[model samples]
Target chain A: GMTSSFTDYCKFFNRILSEVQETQEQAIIKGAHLVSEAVMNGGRFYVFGSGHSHMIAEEIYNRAGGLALVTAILPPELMLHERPNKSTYLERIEGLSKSYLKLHQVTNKDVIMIISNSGRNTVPVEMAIESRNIGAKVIAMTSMKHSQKVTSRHKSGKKLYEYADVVLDNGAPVGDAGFQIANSEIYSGATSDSIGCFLAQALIVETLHLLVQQGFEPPVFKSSNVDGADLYNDKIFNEYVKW
Target chain B: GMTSSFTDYCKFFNRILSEVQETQEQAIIKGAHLVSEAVMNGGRFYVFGSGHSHMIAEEIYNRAGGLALVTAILPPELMLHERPNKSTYLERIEGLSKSYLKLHQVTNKDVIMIISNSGRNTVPVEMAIESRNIGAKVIAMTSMKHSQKVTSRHKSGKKLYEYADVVLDNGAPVGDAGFQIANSEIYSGATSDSIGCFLAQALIVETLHLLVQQGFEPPVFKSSNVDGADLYNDKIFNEYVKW
Candidate 1:
């Protein structure tokens, strides 16, 4: 019976990952187009997320075989290590979004992809709205299954997906765990993270494909392990990145 | 034709994730037992990795609906944000593992899980050996397919899996990409991250199950968003965590 919990959860993980390819194909395509357009216009692609969601932002920023034009908006306060529970509490706090916005500059031509699994939190919701107001395109990645169920926590009465140009569903369960723990009321093993990383990488791949279609060569980072890769990567970084 | 490239990669992602469930099942069960024993004996669960592999370390540390005793050994130099390619350079360096080991006090009763997608890295291999020498159990997560193909990057010629007590294959493709680009020689969309997160979460779930089976009430962290969760979580954190 205990073995069933582990085995069954992985099966559910595969099911949801497979479902994403089917359900979110068009959204991924749209997100890719926005990212490709931003990069082609000499604008950066900015990523924002709170808690474990921030991992998705880091998943693509200057990654090996990934684009160099990507920038992650990482605030130490909202991350796991410094204050673990504070990330959960601060995410719901209003007015904090603008303070972070003041620190980072987003151009009108840039695209900011904000990820919030529940999509009801105040920071992500307000950040999406405020980023759009600044003329930067907002792409929201969240769980439509979960977001639809929860009332918005922001004062604007909007969830993350509502303020975005393109919305990509993470296909997470309402409370994040699809598999039920046997004989326990608790839900273990969150499903959003694995699929969320896939979504992040998928957009990168699709963006590369879109840019190549336009006969534009996008600057991507090569792994430093390869011969002569460091000099080439350094050159690309110097040309594309300012901060 | 370009669309085929994107669609095909998702299929490959699904295939490898399912393979992990079939192949890594025993390893997961074994890993869970070690972690459960460590926690029951008043020891912490330690996680470490260099570069993007560090995300796995962050995935479970103080995660909501997760065990509170988890400690992530995050050295600033080994992460992505600070000097992107330096992380790649540092993972290949020998003797750097001792510096991290000296900073963190891992007792004989503790468990440290080190993740390296390719087990050829020097730091992860040395970390595994050193952690075990200190009497702590080592769980190595890496790609057997990739690790087997490469020559060891360590001075001792021992890869990470060789030094580990329990080796869990991440099932990543050789060079970390299973899908090839349509026209170019490039391979897009790395597959290790999503599955790695799943593997991390699965260990937490199985460990919880094993602990519950022993009539031990494990101290799990509740989300701070829920009412009264902060005080309860603060109490548990104070009891288990010292640093």
Candidate 2:
């Protein structure tokens, strides 16, 4: 028998699949176009997420057939909270901002994606704001319900979703994430991971399609699970990589 | 009941636990000394690995209590066979090397750990060799069996292990991984992830002790994991971070 929660998710996926709405497709297409632009211009795609959200960054940055210029911003100092002046919540924002800038100089040409379910963390919000100020296009992936309830540290008092150029909802319930328990102990299940993977695939698919539309060869790797995948991907792989 | 292969793993783990006379305490102590020396000297600790081996790089890079100033050199290109002759390989490595130089500005004070089960992949080997040329102390984590069996790209025919100043073995099987079978299909169930995590924790404990021994406050976030885990982490997150 299927669990009630998983059954509900199945229904949710079914609904989304059946809707086939133009607006959703347009959003995905636009995001893809944005990624293509960043890549063609020699700009890299940068992903930043905290805690479990980091899984999303890993999914896109290290996917089996992803781009070479994708970078993930992971500083343990930020992960473990090592910044001074911990008093002012805003200082936390400054810490994250400084951390990102220090780790990789985010320029105007880069595409930055910041993920936080609550959309209220001082650090993630600060990253979004700082990235925008530096002329980089910012994408926010969070729960709309979570964003509306949480207060942000920014002077504008808006959550990260409000500051981004694009927002991809993870379709989670409000008031933070819930978990499944089995035999009175915590067990498998989280919404963000699957949703994050979906978003990443969508972004990649769209980006590749746009490149093809422009008569440029898409730089996707051939499927390793299939025969001749190596031969198909080798031409591009050897031409661009240092091995 | 757990699956048969899982039981096999348990048996294997116990065998290693009992037969291997060296205490984990020793490895932890050595890792700590290595990290502490690198940190106190104001040097960067770089991690490099390829394929699934990249998991080791991730384990150490963004760990909860990990040392700051840790960087990882992972292959960014998605080509199946990564060789220097491919343009993508060439451009990607050049870009990565340039980024490493720009961000870290290699010095004799830096420490580098390169992981490759086979110890012969071109990219990780190249980084290890090049980083050494710039005076960084190199550490290699690889399997002795794999090193002896596989061939490397260098004209000198040296595996990554040969180039390192230190070597940490993950104790993987001869082929360097373990797997589980379901419906006649193989699913990898390797020990590297757990071993890598163990390595990270061990490194931190030793480094902390070393810092205290040297009369430095260690900058460790002792904030209890009880309530303010995130706060505690963020509090000290900036101390070791330079950006």
Candidate 3:
């Protein structure tokens, strides 16, 4: 029945959510502290991801009710809409991450978050390494189970979690998909993006709370549908964003 | 405790997933049939959304194991990374959807899938209208609970679900965030995008199954990490996509 498949999807999502809570709580809190500290110190928060993982970057950057100091590092070639197959090939190619980091002018004071479900891709691994090389705090959102089962694609022989200051496992399985239909051998449902989005939003909410507790009025974006939100967002953009 | 919050999040996601199963199974099957029929007839599949809902469009287009003929209609002003606040404002502005549809040259044989958590948003509603006006089949992924609670922003006073030929509810609550933390009146844990992603993937899997059952070789994208995928994807691109 359709109910069985739907239940499988729900159960998989719930499993990931519970795992994220059980394993990633400390990392999430620590990550929030680092991001809040950077924001209070007038530093930027940069988020980067390749392929489907890039949606996690979009989840955190310039979102309604999200902080204003976050920057989205979007590479056209790494994006899905622009030649996805090419982007997939490019993500495996070493050295492109470093070039992209330099092109974005990422600096020492920035907080960089790299997201990948498997954490095996060369681009995400190199981005984590390069961010670390630049003295940036690195937060990685990835699946430990998935990553541990795969070989690293980077020349440095390191996965994304290895180089990050904080690692938040998205809790997806080795193959990303989690559901098994009655007669099917392969799993069907994929939960990384959903859990990753939850992790990103939870991190931001926790960071916002910590920033307020630290007595810093973290600039946040109001929903534009709200009255006077335009003026509020304008002031924050003028104050925080460089471009 | 953090566990309580995490449980609440899981419960909400599971609840939405169950509701989607309970209510939208028929719509999902029907919607998938529409999309498969369009692809079988040599027509394209188009996906559109604004704000966070736009991630659903990204979820389906150019994804690994996704259909090759699907086109994501992304307008810069409606994208969060380009201008979050401005994009929020523009999504509510009337007439932008029609222009975008025109720019994409959407036609009668196409299948247009519009996603919005709250179906009250003007852009998604108008996009549905314009897509249908151009004679395309419209499939909407949205929250019926959420849409019923909000007033439409469009001048026609019609919500996205009203204009859609098939409506698949993601099963989010009215506010889209529905988890109450201990000792707080305010709720947290947004589930629309997460649930929406699940729904999108589920719809695609179902559509692919139907297409295969109907004896049409659905042009599914292979993971680029796999060997010889480039050649396979290139052939599909050459055969299906027009520029």
- Minimal lDDT window, size 10, model 1 chain A: A177-186
Predicted candidate 2 versus true structure: per-residue lDDT over B1-243, tens digit per residue: 121222333344434322221434454456556767878887767775655455455544433334446655444342122322242344324235435544656678887787766666566667677778888887777766557776775555777888887677666554422332222222222344334433443444445555655655544332112256466456556545443
- lDDT per residue for candidate 3 within B1-243, as digits (tens), equals 432244344455566666776777678788888988998887898998888788888887765556778888877577766654677788888889888888888999999999987888789988998898899999998878878878888889889999999998888776554554334333445677876887887777677666656667777665534567678878887777542
Stretches of candidate 2 exceeding 4 Å from the true structure: A1-243, B1-5, B13-28, B69-103, B180-187, B221-239
TM-scores, one per candidate: 0.92, 0.47, 0.85
Sorting all predicted structures by TM-score, with the top scorer first, yields 1, 3, 2
- Per-candidate fnat, comma-separated: 0.38, 0.01, 0.19
Better of 1 and 2 by DockQ: 1
Q: Candidate 1: which pairs clash?
A: none
**Residue range B1-243, candidate 1, lDDT tens digits:** 555346766776778887888888889999999999999998889999888888898888876666878889887688866655678788888788887877788779899999998888888988998999999999999989888878888888878899988988989877665455556645567777888989999888888878887778888766534566678878898887543
At residue A63, candidate 1 shows an lDDT of 68
lDDT of 3 at B164: 91
Question: How well does candidate 2 match the true structure in TM-score terms?
Answer: 0.47
Highest TM-score model number: 1
Model 3 per-residue lDDT at B148: 85
lDDT of 2: 0.54
List candidate 3 segments past 4 Å from native. Answer: A1-8, A11-18, A92-96, A99-105, A175-188, A212-217, A224-231, A241-243, B1-22, B92-96, B173-189, B213-217, B224-231, B241-243
